Subunit: 388 residues, 4 copies
């Protein structure tokens, strides 16, 4: 086995094609399925895995009451092969209420954060054994991506944030070789508030598209030099912005270096990536809440903060159906690196009151250079009929 370098061109992308769905909530109506949130997909050199943060319970289970909560001692990172729903035989790969995973071409890395809100611990688990850990630096919910980290030449990188949700915080990018934290660079450049980075290889570096929870409805960008550890940061230029909340299409504005200051507070995890000077991104369709999910190409939307010229719109989930977190992952082809995305379909509290629990299913798409049609892939669970 060799290390993944990802030293290949990004694939031709004309839009995205259907790839997986787990129907997890519909299945949990007549089966033992884990209660989850904050899921993601990541793949070894052969095949993909779906991950999620469990609530240490199944759904048709008295313990599923109040799974609205973000951090308990019972949250673990569940890891299955993609499209195998989180059944009772699913492996919990670490204790974690925040996490991120990747494969360097030789073995898995899991970055797992649990413990006290004011003093959480990040364990680093590579090749099925604990190799390192770090404390919270700022003592206020040490957290990371909730999607795949990225490894190049065997150096894995991961964005972690400690401190305020709605003010300045302390973001650090760690570098990991065989599970060992070998360097820490701190957040630098013009990105002001960084979370939950959806990151992807982009030889010779990594690139991340994050969530500003403070002043921006534009998403931050972070560029990571793997070799000398340098960090630059900015925002997705594109005049059509990717966070939720945001202002509508006619009212919105962005900026390449600064938060737009537009409904900025709060956010949702999301993704985007560069296509020359164009940008592919997706987002919730509804501008205030996590209902619906679309993707498009903004032309010059990677280098022109004034551009609102989208093309290749696809509805992934229609505007009446619920979405949630979404993130990028990258899959090496024969000649090129393709780009894929998953989308958390959240059901339950607080939005839905028919049931006491909070879970999610996923649906997953992949970049295609072929043709494709139209549709809608929502959760499909009828909450009026689920475990009373």
């Amino acid at each position: 086995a060799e290390y993944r370098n990802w030293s290949k061109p990004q694939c031709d992308i004309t839009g995205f094609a259907p790839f997986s769905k787990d129907n997890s909530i519909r299945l949990s109506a007549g089966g033992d399925i884990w209660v989850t949130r904050e899921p993601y997909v990541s793949c070894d050199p052969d095949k993909c895995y779906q991950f999620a943060l469990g609530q240490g319970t199944t759904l048709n289970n008295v313990h599923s009451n109040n799974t609205v909560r973000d951090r308990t001692p019972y949250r673990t990172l569940l890891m299955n092969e993609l499209g195998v729903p989180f059944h009772l035989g699913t492996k919990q790969v670490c204790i974690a209420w925040s996490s991120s995973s990747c494969h360097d071409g030789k073995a898995w890395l899991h970055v797992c954060i649990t413990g006290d809100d004011k003093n959480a611990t990040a364990s680093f688990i590579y090749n099925g054994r604990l190799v390192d850990s770090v404390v919270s630096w700022s003592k206020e919910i040490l957290r990371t991506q909730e999607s795949e980290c990225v490894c190049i030449n065997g150096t894995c990188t991961v964005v972690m944030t400690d401190g305020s949700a709605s003010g300045k915080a302390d973001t650090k990018i760690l570098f990991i070789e065989e599970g060992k934290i070998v360097h820490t660079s701190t957040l630098s450049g013009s990105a002001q508030h960084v979370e939950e980075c959806s990151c992807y290889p982009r030889y010779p570096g990594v690139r991340c598209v994050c969530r500003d929870n403070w002043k921006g409805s534009n998403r931050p960008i972070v560029d990571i030099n793997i070799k000398d550890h340098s960090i630059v940061s900015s925002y997705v230029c594109s005049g059509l912005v990717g966070d939720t909340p945001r202002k509508n299409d006619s009212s919105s504005s962005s900026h390449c270096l600064d938060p737009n200051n537009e409904e900025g507070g709060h956010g949702v995890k999301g993704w985007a990536f560069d296509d020359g000077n164009d940008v592919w991104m997706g987002r919730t369709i509804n501008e205030t809440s996590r209902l619906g999910y679309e993707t498009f190409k903004v032309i010059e939307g990677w280098s022109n903060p004034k551009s609102k010229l989208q093309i290749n719109r696809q509805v992934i989930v229609d505007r009446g159906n619920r979405s949630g977190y979404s993130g990028i992952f990258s899959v090496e082809g024969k000649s090129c690196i393709n780009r894929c995305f998953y989308v958390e379909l959240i059901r339950g509290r607080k939005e839905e009151t028919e049931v006491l629990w909070t879970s999610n299913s996923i649906v997953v798409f992949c970049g295609t250079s072929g043709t494709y049609g139209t549709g809608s892939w929502p959760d499909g669970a009828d909450l009026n009929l689920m475990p009373i």
Copy 2:
């Protein structure tokens, strides 16, 4: 690992021997089993897999109401090892309400069709990663085999139909190398309406025996040249015809080049294959509905449209018990290529009203050059006692 060429003679066939049954519906009476239809078997160079189109639900599950429906967003292709019933730990290999799979000797191909009836998308997934997709060409339920595709020298072929069920439609045969659509040939020769081809290697080409849903109770044949991409087409000569509906044995007639125009409208998925100038086929015993299932050898039935001389009849499922789709698959022996078949045993709506759901189990047989006896392998589920 090398590519499958299948450059071996077809095995001596004196009839078929029992091979698998999953008892899926009986199991679903006290366990969590997926609701399925449109199943098939296909095998890698070591071992076989059962596939089916799930309804994104298990049976003892409120979501199993109305699984009569043919296409929802929740349908995925389930893939298990043959004889492992579709339990909750079963892997969903793509989103699909129409599908077809094969192994080229190196890796799996899945052809998966989902999305809008008028604009469905066909994703092509090879070696656990999406490589291509195509849109509907005619905008009316893009669909494919519901049984294994066939790959020779690493070029996989698959029949896909778009357009009318009960008039002319646009059938295309695609060619796929490592998940990449490398050519499309359109349907040619004298076959008028083509569906759900049960296809099998026949070095140097592929051969398919399809379903005419329009004017024929004889089944179409399609011959696919893998090397220069040419396509010829006709009908199964044999005077005893293989579709359902059909006219009875004394009243029936066929034709080698044309639909018999005999109760032709509608049909059911089925299979047949040549044995010199003889033909092996199977079919439902009842001539109007999917009750019972038999197989036989019509002598000169591959080259003489007047022949009604059958021998080696076997009842697979008796005439009081329900059948459904059936299709061929092919298994490489030490010296020869054997031929096998599965048979969908459909239970539930609309025919059976004791329950609100629609599922199936399977039973599977294989060509044998040995001797064999007699029996009946129905579904065995007592619907009077199942999830009320």
Copy 3:
């Protein structure tokens, strides 16, 4: 991978040591466990598998009513790794109401018999593909071992019986190379009625200890020359006899060449093997029914029909708890071939009336040259409390 020859000495045996138990019936009280009977253990060169004949249902399942019946269309051979209870994810390896399996060192053989009582079919499945089949020869429940076949130099042998349970029948020993029936020898020598042979390698041949269902409470022996296909047969000399029913210890008698004519009618599957001129065997403790299970060494009990000198008694299952079929299997050590046995613990009908079903669990022991103690390993299920 090479072929198993088993060209090693039988291990020193001072008695048997505990090896596995599946608690299948106790588990089925709060889980989805298959209804089974006629189980056995067999092992590949690495590890062991438990097999059983399923009733195409789980226990807490309406379909478990009447699983007393010996042959239905829904019976399949279940195969798990040893000590993994027959859960819903268990693989059904063929359709079978009678079966036998072995590994030649390269791949599995399954011998599977299903279909009409008067015209049953025996499929031969090797390396995950059907290679041969035979019809019933005598048209009266073609049946085989219900325990492992034995393969030497890649020629597997299996005893099959067709015809009368309580008169002369037609026993044949088949020889199989890569799933192909390459020869059939018919039953020869002085054994009059042969069933359900518990067979074991004994270089250069195989040896079997069977069930006489007609005139003998002594068990038959069958010797199989793998190279020239010759067959001799007799009975276990030992004056303490191994069938059930039988006469008590003081009243009993045997004979090396002839059925003892002692309560002979009927029987139960069992095992024994030679240790020089001594014999190891086990049997039910109760002499008329399948309650309890013991093992011992009869000294000179392999060559002297008058000897009733037992030593090294072990209770495997105490005389108040239910037993059932038991059979031998053989496990290659570094220097020697060890001998092991499983014991069917039958629960349910007709003997137990608290429930409508009929199943079994297993317990398994292995030959040891060490020391060992005493105990009792019954089924442990409280049928007064099970699925009403």
Copy 4:
């Protein structure tokens, strides 16, 4: 594959980092989970396994009544991959009410003890086959570690005790090469009462930290020379003692060679290991019962019986939540041997009366040379709401 020598330095340890949790009891509230006690973790050269002694039942199961009992015929050793909860598809690797497992670098050894209290049998199972067994020597609950054995150069060692719980007993250390008992050394040196040793490699020997159930609240130490089979024994010097019960921190005293005679009677399984002349250990926080669980480094606590200078305290489980057995396991890194521990979280009888059963979940930590924070990882099951 080569033999594990463990000829590497013990890793830098600054405390312990989170590693796994199975939430087994919370899961058993809406799923089929085994009833267990006496669990442990052990790892092959790639990955870790959780083990436990099952009660031959699942929790939501009538058979879970009275699982308070220590030895029944239905207890088997369950083995899963670490963090896969003991679901119904879990493999029972032997019959055992006392056990211990290890991997020599080539294959697993299981040491399994079942049968009569006064005449129990210890089976030794290596590479999926029984190789040896021994009887009870003293005829009073032959028992072993309930945590991993240790293998060096392919000689595995294991501590076993027979005889009195609250007086002198007969402890022996066995040596096993490929499952074969090749020598037995008896307990020697100044350790008076030995149980349930938590053992760990320490090249060139093994070292164990045990439970004195008679006169000591200090834990015994046993040193095992693998090459010449010699045995020395003593007690953990450290003035803060590791058993439960014990006297409080201000009242307590220890002794390097003798039981402290301090509330000594009874005990709980535990672990410790040397760090130069310092000692790492953990223990229950409550001094009389198995509520809470902490770990610390006593400075000079390995060579000075007067030292009560602890540093690097971590709460693993807070003082209101239940603990239980805990034990060490060892994981080979690239350059060093790390040390990890699991902790049995016991729920049910006799302490908790809301339910009739007795089970446990686990939580697992690992030595880290990094930094770490604070938290609490209890069982989390609400017994007021569980299977009535």
